């Protein structure tokens, strides 16, 4: 959350929030309504987003679903689509929070360790997230898609 981060950054210095931080909190609470609208649109179109992202991933990375691949079989493919749904949900959280704190605190800290322990290639997850980003930005307006892909790009950068 933007409010939380402003409060901590002001708390470390032992000072009240300066007028710049209050200005930014004000601008955030004023834009909260379109934030909720965008989260609506992304939230309730989750099935198509996950499905079409899974397709673009499996066509771009046939090895992961090839015989023996990490997501090989019905159950493993279902689990991979489950992971993509996890990350779409986190992106909606980040959109409503106004900052990548929800995405980063849940799903980004220690993601490389987890996926290395599971035997999953992290580049495949990055490809899936990019495919979901294109599919989801296709359903938004220009400025809305720009603001929404803003978080997919951060999730991709953290997942290199």
């Amino acid at each position: 959350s933007i409010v939380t981060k402003s409060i901590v950054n002001a708390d470390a210095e032992a000072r009240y929030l300066s007028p710049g931080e209050l200005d930014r909190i004000k601008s955030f609470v004023l834009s909260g309504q379109r934030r909720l609208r965008i989260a609506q649109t992304l939230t309730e179109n989750r099935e198509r987003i996950v499905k079409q992202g899974g397709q673009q991933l499996f066509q771009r990375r046939p090895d992961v679903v090839s015989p023996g691949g990490n997501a090989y079989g019905e159950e493993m493919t279902a689990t991979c689509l489950r992971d993509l749904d996890y990350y779409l949900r986190l992106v909606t959280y980040g959109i409503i929070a106004g900052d990548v704190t929800p995405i980063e605190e849940i799903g980004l800290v220690g993601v490389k360790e987890m996926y290395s322990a599971l035997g999953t290639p992290i580049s495949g997850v990055a490809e899936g997230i990019r495919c979901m980003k294109d599919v989801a930005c296709s359903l938004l307006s220009g400025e809305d898609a720009a603001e929404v892909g803003f978080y997919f790009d951060y999730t991709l950068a953290a997942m290199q």
């Binding site: 708390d11 470390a12 210095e13 032992a14 000072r15």
Partner: protein
Amino acid sequence: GLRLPQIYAKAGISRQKFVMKPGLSTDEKQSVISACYRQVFERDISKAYGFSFSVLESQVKNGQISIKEFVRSLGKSSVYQKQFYQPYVNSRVVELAFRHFLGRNLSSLAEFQKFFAILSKKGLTGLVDSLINSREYSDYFNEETVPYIRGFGEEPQECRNWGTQIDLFQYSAPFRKVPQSITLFSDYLKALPDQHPYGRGNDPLLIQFGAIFPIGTKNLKQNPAPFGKDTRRLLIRRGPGIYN
């Protein structure tokens, strides 16, 4: 961040600092190095047990290394890891290192998580390097001042690690073998524990014939918690749950 009226610390007996300008007398150099020993090892081990660091002491007296580098290579010596690394668990090692190299206690849970992860992955030299290379160390001690204890009357304190810090600044600290700050900062965020309304030492061992209270003078594993007057312990039935 905190704030303190400047005369609130000007009262009283005034903890003093030790600086290591080369060119001082030999008297002052010896006093500074012995203050460094008392800070890093909690007491002068050079005079008690005849431990010595010849190369380090000569290099620091000549000015080839600063007091910061001297403390850094004291913290990764064999003496230090025999006295304050081997007989402890890593969670306790972090807490003791913060007292020895920063003169203060852990502040946050995230701070513990960060420095425990560093010690986790890189060992004692990694932990010590991350401590002395920090911005806070240079803010308090820039290359020449021996680290000192930042007690109560020295600096504006926060009421969150109050008692834990006051207990860290005691000679009894190296005998609390259970970590004191990770557990405290964890229990701030959880409900009340499952224990006697009085201290944790008021619970006996449920054995055949007992009267055994393991917590006490010899153990020092003690955890008071605020239990209201109205409160009921969740007991487990010796038998099926439903006859509870």
